[PDB]
């Protein structure tokens, strides 16, 4: 029932994500010189360094907010992909499955701790 535990759990999960080779295209903001039309398709860029920095600055109030930004990394890749078979998109799908598998207990534990706090 620790209402704060999610933060360190998210730091450790982001550490695992940065160790994954599949996260390399998503570690830093998309380079506009490599993908000149990126902002014509994507309204809200997001990357894992921005997520980590937001967490470390104390600018997420809950793991749901972090989860919304990580999911935006994956939806941006899906929206930008020219093909559902593209290399970078395929890496995003594996990384998304890994993230979802690990974030589920973080969200469950936080929501349960918060319900206990408000009992
Ligand atoms: C990091 C993502 C964009 O959000 N990246 C550039 C791409 N995403 C999917 C397919 C091809 C790509 F090049």
From Swiss-Prot:
Coiled-coil regions listed in the entry: none
User: Which positions does the record annotate as the modified residue Phosphothreonine?
Assistant: 44
Task: Name where it's found.
Answer: Nucleus
Q: The Bromo domain covers which part of the protein? A: 1-106
Q: Which residues carry this modification: Phosphoserine?
A: 90
- Tissue specificity annotation: Expressed in myeloma and epidermoid carcinoma cell lines.
Domain of life of the organism encoding this protein: Eukaryota
Q: What subunit structure does UniProt give?
A: Interacts with IRS1 and IRS2. Interacts (via bromo domain) with acetylated lysine residues on histone H1.4, histone H3 and H4 (in vitro).
Q: Which disease is it linked to?
A: Chung-Jansen syndrome: An autosomal dominant disorder characterized by developmental delay, intellectual disability, autistic features, anxiety, hypotonia, obesity, and dysmorphic features.
Its function, per the record, reads: Probable regulator of the insulin and insulin-like growth factor signaling pathways. Stimulates cell proliferation through regulation of cyclin transcription and has an anti-apoptotic activity through AKT1 phosphorylation and activation. Plays a role in the regulation of cell morphology and cytoskeletal organization.
Query: What protein does this entry describe?
Result: PH-interacting protein
**This protein's encoding gene:** PHIP
């Amino acid at each position: 029932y620790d209402i704060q535990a999610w933060k360190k759990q998210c730091e450790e999960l982001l550490n695992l994500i940065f160790q994954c080779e599949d996260s390399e295209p998503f570690r830093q903001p998309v380079d506009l010189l490599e993908y000149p039309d990126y902002r014509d398709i994507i309204d809200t860029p997001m990357d894992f360094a921005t997520v980590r920095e937001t967490l470390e600055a104390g600018n997420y109030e809950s793991p749901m907010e972090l989860c919304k930004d990580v999911r935006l990394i994956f939806s941006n890749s899906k929206a930008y992909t020219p093909s559902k078979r593209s290399r970078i998109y395929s890496m995003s799908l594996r990384l998304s499955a890994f993230f979802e598998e690990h974030i589920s207990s973080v969200l469950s534990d936080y929501k349960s701790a918060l319900r206990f706090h408000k009992r």
